[PDB]
Design a protein around this motif. Structure first.
Motif, mmCIF file in Angstrom:
data_model
loop_
_atom_site.group_PDB
_atom_site.id
_atom_site.type_symbol
_atom_site.label_atom_id
_atom_site.label_comp_id
_atom_site.label_asym_id
_atom_site.label_seq_id
_atom_site.Cartn_x
_atom_site.Cartn_y
_atom_site.Cartn_z
ATOM 1 N N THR A 52 -51.063 27.000 -53.628
ATOM 2 C CA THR A 52 -52.417 26.765 -53.128
ATOM 3 C C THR A 52 -52.503 26.371 -51.664
ATOM 4 O O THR A 52 -53.275 26.980 -50.913
ATOM 5 C CB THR A 52 -53.065 25.610 -53.919
ATOM 6 N N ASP A 53 -51.591 25.528 -51.200
ATOM 7 C CA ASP A 53 -51.765 24.973 -49.860
ATOM 8 C C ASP A 53 -50.441 24.609 -49.213
ATOM 9 O O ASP A 53 -50.445 23.941 -48.163
ATOM 10 C CB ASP A 53 -52.730 23.762 -49.857
ATOM 11 N N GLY A 54 -49.320 24.991 -49.808
ATOM 12 C CA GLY A 54 -48.049 24.709 -49.179
ATOM 13 C C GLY A 54 -46.935 25.405 -49.916
ATOM 14 O O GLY A 54 -47.149 26.133 -50.899
ATOM 15 N N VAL A 80 -37.338 22.236 -47.132
ATOM 16 C CA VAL A 80 -38.487 21.609 -46.484
ATOM 17 C C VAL A 80 -39.729 21.981 -47.269
ATOM 18 O O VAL A 80 -39.830 23.097 -47.796
ATOM 19 C CB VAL A 80 -38.657 21.994 -45.003
ATOM 20 N N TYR A 81 -40.651 21.023 -47.377
ATOM 21 C CA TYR A 81 -41.993 21.260 -47.882
ATOM 22 C C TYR A 81 -42.932 21.266 -46.681
ATOM 23 O O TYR A 81 -42.961 20.301 -45.910
ATOM 24 C CB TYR A 81 -42.409 20.186 -48.904
ATOM 25 N N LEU A 82 -43.665 22.364 -46.504
ATOM 26 C CA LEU A 82 -44.680 22.477 -45.462
ATOM 27 C C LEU A 82 -46.017 22.664 -46.140
ATOM 28 O O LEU A 82 -46.124 23.440 -47.101
ATOM 29 C CB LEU A 82 -44.418 23.676 -44.529
ATOM 30 N N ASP A 83 -47.041 21.967 -45.652
ATOM 31 C CA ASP A 83 -48.363 22.153 -46.261
ATOM 32 C C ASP A 83 -49.464 22.045 -45.209
ATOM 33 O O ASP A 83 -49.243 21.577 -44.094
ATOM 34 C CB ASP A 83 -48.603 21.183 -47.438
ATOM 35 N N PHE A 84 -50.660 22.505 -45.577
ATOM 36 C CA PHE A 84 -51.823 22.427 -44.698
ATOM 37 C C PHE A 84 -52.516 21.067 -44.809
ATOM 38 O O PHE A 84 -52.612 20.483 -45.893
ATOM 39 C CB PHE A 84 -52.825 23.532 -45.056
HETATM 40 MG MG LIG Z 1 -50.969 18.715 -50.805
#
Ligand SMILES: [Mg+2]
Ligand SMILES: Nc1ncnc2c1ncn2[C@H]1C[C@H](O)[C@@H](COP(=O)(O)NP(=O)(O)OP(=O)(O)O)O1
Ligand SMILES: [Mg+2]
Ligand SMILES: [Mg+2]
Ligand SMILES: [Mg+2]
Ligand SMILES: [Mg+2]
Length: 756
Positions: free
Chosen positions: A541-543, A401-405
Motif C-alpha cells: 500500500t505505501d512502502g 531496508v523498509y522504505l515508505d511514504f
Molecule cells: Mg506505514
DNA sequence: TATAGGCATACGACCACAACTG
DNA sequence: ACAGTTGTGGTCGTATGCCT
C-alpha cells in the motif's frame, strides 16, 4: 472552559444552556435568542409565499415557518441561492421538513438534522475543553446481588465504591472491618450517602466502566423502588438515560459522564476488555477478579465480605486511575473536533469527521450536503479496488531496508486537489488526471477537504518538531496528544470519501486516491530496481522491503539513502519517501504475515497468530518462541525441542487453562448468524440465561475434552473448573499449536519434523 | 446500529452417495 | 429388496481480525 451545551424549553421556546467552569467555579450561561433553521432550494423564487404556508402538528400544537431569509452560499464550490427557514422550536423541524421537501416548488432541503446544541456550538464558534482549568475527577462503581433467573435490578445493590486523588472508599450496609469501608443501615441509606458524597465532592467528571449500560440504570431502578430522588446533576436533575443505537448512554447535567469502556475499546487493541485486563495492559500490574456468584454466596452467608469489599474498592481505584490517564487525550480530540467530550468520547469515526467538516463548512459559508436517503445509500454500497500488495518473495532475507511514504493518501489528496468540488469542474486552466481511472481534478482553486487537510498536516509536522524540541514533559505530552488527534482525523479522510453514509461522499475521489497511490508505489519500486539494483521483497500500500542481494549492510544502507535523495527530487508536491528502518533479517511468510529483526535483536511481527486474539496463548507463545529461535538464533533443533515440550505438557493436561482461552468478538445480534461457530454457540447459551450479549461483546471460551462437534464442547472460561472439566488436549495440539508453528517452520524451509 | 479495502485462515452448512436399520 | 438414519468424503460460503 465550556463543558457542555444542551437546551430546555420555556413557554414553548428553546433556551440554550452552556455549562462552563471558569476560574474554579461552575457557571450556567443561558441563551434565549438562538433559532433553529433549515435551508431550502426552490425552483421559483415566487413559490416561497406558499412555503411559508406549510404547517404540521407536533402532537396537537400547530407548527408553522416562523420567518424566512434569502441567502447566498457555496455548494460544491459553486455559488447557490437558498432560503433559510427559521422555526420557533427545534422539534418543529422533524415534523414539517417532510412536508417542505415534498412540496412541488422545493427542489431539496439542507442542514435539517444537526442537533440543536451541536448546531449552537458550531454557529457560535464555541469550542469545548479549551483553556487551562483543572477539572475535578471522581470514579465510582457498584456491586449488586445477582441470580440467574432474575429480572433487571431485581436484587439490591450491595456496595458502592468511589475513588479520587484523596483515596478510595466503599459504602455498604453489612458490617466490614477495613479502614476504607463505611457501613450504613440499609441499601437506601447507602445510596443516599453516596449521593451526599458526590454533592459534597462536586466533581466535574464522573468516571465509570460501562456505567452507560449497567450502573446508572441499576441505580435508577433501585431509587424508583426505594423512593430516592437521585439528584446527581449540578442543576438538581437525575441522570438522563438515552438510547444510542443498540445501547444506551447516560448524561449527568453539569458534569461529564466519562465512561471509559467505549474510549478504551477504540483506543487500544486487547484480546479482552475486562477491567482487569485493561488495567494490567495500561499499568502492568495484575488485578484479581471476584465473580458475581462468589459475591452473592458471600453476602448471603456473611462469610468473606472483606475479600469482596477489597474487590469493590479496587474496581473504583483502577477506574479512577484509568480515567486520569485517558481523559487528556480525549479532551484534545474533542478540542480538535469542536464538540463536547461527552459526544466525542462516545462517537464513531464518521461522526467525528462530520462534526469537524460541518464546523469548517460553517466558517466558510459552504452549504453541507445531506446524508444519503435509502436509495442512494443502497447505490453507494459497491466496493472499489484497494491498495497495491506485491506477493512476497517468501522465506528468509538478509540486510533489508523498509522504505515508505509519509502520509501517502493525505499527501495525494493535497497534491492533486482531490475533492468533490474540484472533480471534473469545468473551465479551468490546469487539471490533474488520476491514472487508470481518468478522473480529472481542477488545480485552479483549492478544494474544501484538500485545504483542511493541508492545514492539519502542516500543524502536525510543526508539532512533531516542537515535541522533541521542548524539554518539558508537560508540553511534550500535550503536544503528543494534539498530534495524535490530528493523525486520526487526517487518516480518516480517504476512508470518509468512500463511507456510504458520508455527507461529502465521493467515490471518484476514493478511487483516484487509490489509483495515484498504486501508481506512486509501483513506479518507485520500478525505479529502485532498475536504477539502483535493488530487489523488492514485499510491498503493501505505501512502502516496501528491499535489499541488494549480494551486498553487506553498509552498502545496502548507503544505496538506499542515495535512492531516497534521487526519488524525492522527482516526487511532486507533498509526496515524499522516507527511510523507515534497517532489518538484519526478515521472514516473509505470506501477504500481510511476516517478521523482521533489527540489528539490536528486536523482533517485530505483523499478522502472525502471535498478535491475534482468536488464538490461544499456548499457541501464540509457542509460535513466538519458535520465531525467536529461528529468526534470532537460527536454531531449528531448539524450535523442534520447544514444540515437542509444549505438545507433551498439553497431552499430560499440565498446561493451565488460562493459556487455552480463545477470544472472539460477537459482531451482530445472535439472530443474524447464518453459521453458528463455537463463540456464537457459547454466546447463544449465555443469552438463554441472564447474560445480555450485544455486538462487541468478547466471548472467551475453552474447548472441553470429548467427541462430537466443537460447538457443543466449548464453555465460557468463567465456568471452567480444573476439577470438573478436562480440556481437549488434542484440539489444542493439532488445531492450535502445530498449525501455528509449522507455518513458521515451513517459511524457513523445514517441512517435516516429528513435533510429537 | 462500520472511515476504506485486501488477506490468511478454519470451519460450518450443505450435498451427494453408500451402508445400514428396523 | 423397503424408507429412514448414519456415516463419509468433499465443496463453498461465512466469519474474524489483522495490515496499510
Ligand atoms: Mg506505514
Ligand atoms: N485505519 C486506516 N484507515 C484507512 N487507511 C489507512 C489506515 N491505516 C493506514 N491507512 C493507509 C492510509 C495511509 O496513507 C497509509 C499509511 O498510514 P500510516 O500507517 O498511519 N503511516 P503515516 O505516515 O500516515 O503516519 P506516521 O506519521 O505515524 O508514519 O496507509
Ligand atoms: Mg462494575
Ligand atoms: Mg465491579
Ligand atoms: Mg511513518
Ligand atoms: Mg475496516
Amino acid at each position: 472552559m465550556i463543558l457542555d451545551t444542551d437546551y430546555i424549553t420555556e413557554d414553548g421556546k428553546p433556551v440554550i444552556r452552556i455549562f462552563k467552569k471558569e476560574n474554579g467555579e461552575f457557571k450556567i450561561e443561558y441563551d434565549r435568542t438562538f433559532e433553529p433553521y433549515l435551508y431550502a432550494l426552490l425552483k421559483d423564487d415566487s413559490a416561497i409565499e406558499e412555503v411559508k404556508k406549510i404547517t404540521a402538528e407536533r402532537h396537537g400544537t400547530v407548527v408553522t415557518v416562523k420567518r424566512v431569509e434569502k441567502v447566498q452560499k457555496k455548494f460544491l464550490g459553486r455559488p447557490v441561492e437558498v432560503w433559510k427557514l427559521y422555526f420557533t422550536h427545534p422539534q418543529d423541524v422533524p415534523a414539517i421538513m417532510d412536508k417542505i421537501r415534498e412540496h412541488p416548488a422545493v427542489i431539496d432541503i439542507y442542514e435539517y438534522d444537526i442537533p440543536f446544541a451541536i448546531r449552537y456550538l458550531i454557529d457560535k464558534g464555541l469550542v469545548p475543553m479549551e483553556g487551562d482549568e483543572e477539572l475535578k475527577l471522581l470514579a465510582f462503581d457498584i456491586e449488586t446481588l445477582y441470580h440467574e433467573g432474575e429480572e433487571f435490578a431485581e436484587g439490591p445493590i450491595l456496595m458502592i465504591s468511589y475513588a479520587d486523588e484523596e483515596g478510595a472508599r466503599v459504602i455498604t450496609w453489612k458490617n466490614v472491618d477495613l479502614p476504607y469501608v463505611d457501613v450504613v443501615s440499609t441499601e437506601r441509606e447507602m445510596i443516599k450517602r453516596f449521593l451526599r458524597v458526590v454533592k459534597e465532592k462536586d466533581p466535574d467528571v464522573l468516571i465509570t466502566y460501562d456505567g452507560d449500560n449497567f450502573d446508572f440504570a441499576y441505580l435508577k431502578k433501585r431509587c424508583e423502588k426505594l423512593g430516592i430522588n437521585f439528584a446527581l446533576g449540578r442543576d438538581g436533575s437525575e441522570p438522563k438515560i438515552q438510547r444510542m443505537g443498540d445501547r444506551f448512554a447516560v448524561e449527568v447535567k453539569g458534569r461529564i459522564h466519562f465512561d471509559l469502556y467505549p474510549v478504551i475499546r477504540r483506543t487500544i487493541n486487547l484480546p479482552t476488555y475486562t477491567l482487569e485486563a485493561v488495567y494490567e495492559a495500561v499499568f502492568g500490574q495484575p488485578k484479581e477478579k471476584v465473580y458475581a456468584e462468589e459475591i452473592t454466596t458471600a453476602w448471603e452467608t456473611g462469610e468473606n465480605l472483606e475479600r469482596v469489599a477489597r474487590y469493590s474498592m479496587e474496581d473504583a481505584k483502577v477506574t479512577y486511575e484509568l480515567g486520569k490517564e485517558f481523559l487528556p487525550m480525549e479532551a484534545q480530540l474533542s478540542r480538535l473536533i469542536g464538540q463536547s467530550l461527552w459526544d466525542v468520547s462516545r462517537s464513531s469515526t464518521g461522526n467525528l469527521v462530520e462534526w469537524f467538516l460541518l464546523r469548517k463548512a460553517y466558517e466558510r459559508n459552504e452549504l453541507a450536503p445531506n446524508k444519503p436517503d435509502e436509495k442512494e445509500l443502497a447505490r453507494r454500497h459497491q466496493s472499489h479496488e484497494g491498495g497495491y500488495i506485491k506477493e512476497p518473495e517468501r522465506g528468509l532475507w538478509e540486510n533489508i531496508v523498509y522504505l515508505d511514504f509519509r502520509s501517502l493518501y493525505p499527501s495525494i489528496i493535497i497534491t492533486h486537489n482531490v475533492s468533490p468540488d474540484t472533480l471534473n469542474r469545468e473551465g479551468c486552466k490546469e487539471y490533474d488526471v488520476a491514472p487508470q481511472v481518468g478522473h480529472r481534478f481542477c488545480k485552479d482553486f483549492p478544494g474544501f477537504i484538500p485545504s483542511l487537510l493541508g492545514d492539519l498536516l502542516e500543524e502536525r509536522q510543526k508539532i512533531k518538531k516542537r515535541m522533541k524540541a521542548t524539554i518539558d514533559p508537560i508540553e511534550r505530552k500535550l503536544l503528543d496528544y494534539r498530534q495524535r488527534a490530528i493523525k486520526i482525523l487526517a487518516n480518516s479522510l480517504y476512508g470518509y470519501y468512500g463511507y456510504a453514509r458520508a455527507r461529502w461522499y465521493c467515490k471518484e475521489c476514493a478511487e483516484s486516491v487509490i489509483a495515484w497511490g498504486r501508481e506512486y508505489l509501483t513506479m518507485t519500486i520500478k525505479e529502485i530496481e532498475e536504477k539502483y539494483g535493488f530487489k523488492v521483497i514485499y510491498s503493501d500500500t505505501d512502502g516496501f522491503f528491499a535489499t541488494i542481494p549480494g551486498a553487506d549492510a553498509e552498502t545496502v544502507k548507503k544505496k538506499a539513502m542515495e535512492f531516497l535523495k534521487y526519488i524525492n527530487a522527482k516526487l511532486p508536491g507533498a509526496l515524499e519517501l522516507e527511510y523507515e528502518g534497517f532489518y538484519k533479517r526478515g521472514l516473509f511468510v505470506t501477504k500481510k504475515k511476516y517478521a523482521v529483526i533489527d540489528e539490536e535483536g528486536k523482533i517485530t511481527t505483523r499478522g502472525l497468530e502471535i498478535v491475534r486474539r482468536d488464538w490461544s496463548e499456548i499457541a501464540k507463545e509457542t509460535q513466538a518462541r519458535v520465531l525467536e529461535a529461528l529468526l534470532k538464533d537460527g536454531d531449528v533443533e531448539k524450535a523442534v525441542r520447544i514444540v515437542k515440550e509444549v505438545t507433551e505438557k498439553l497431552s499430560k493436561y499440565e498446561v493451565p487453562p488460562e493459556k487455552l482461552v480463545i477470544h472472539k468478538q460477537i459482531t451482530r445480534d445472535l439472530k443474524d448468524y447464518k453459521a453458528t461457530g463455537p463463540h456464537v454457540a457459547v454466546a447463544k447459551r449465555l443469552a438463554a440465561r441472564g447474560v445480555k450479549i450485544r455486538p462487541g461483546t468478547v466471548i472467551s471460551y475453552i474447548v472441553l475434552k470429548g467427541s462430537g462437534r466443537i460447538v457443543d464442547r466449548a464453555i465460557p472460561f468463567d465456568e471452567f473448573d480444573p476439577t470438573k472439566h478436562k480440556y481437549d488436549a488434542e484440539y489444542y495440539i493439532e488445531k492450535q499449536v502445530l498449525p501455528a508453528v509449522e507455518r513458521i517452520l515451513r517459511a524457513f524451509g523445514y517441512r517435516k519434523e516429528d513435533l510429537r
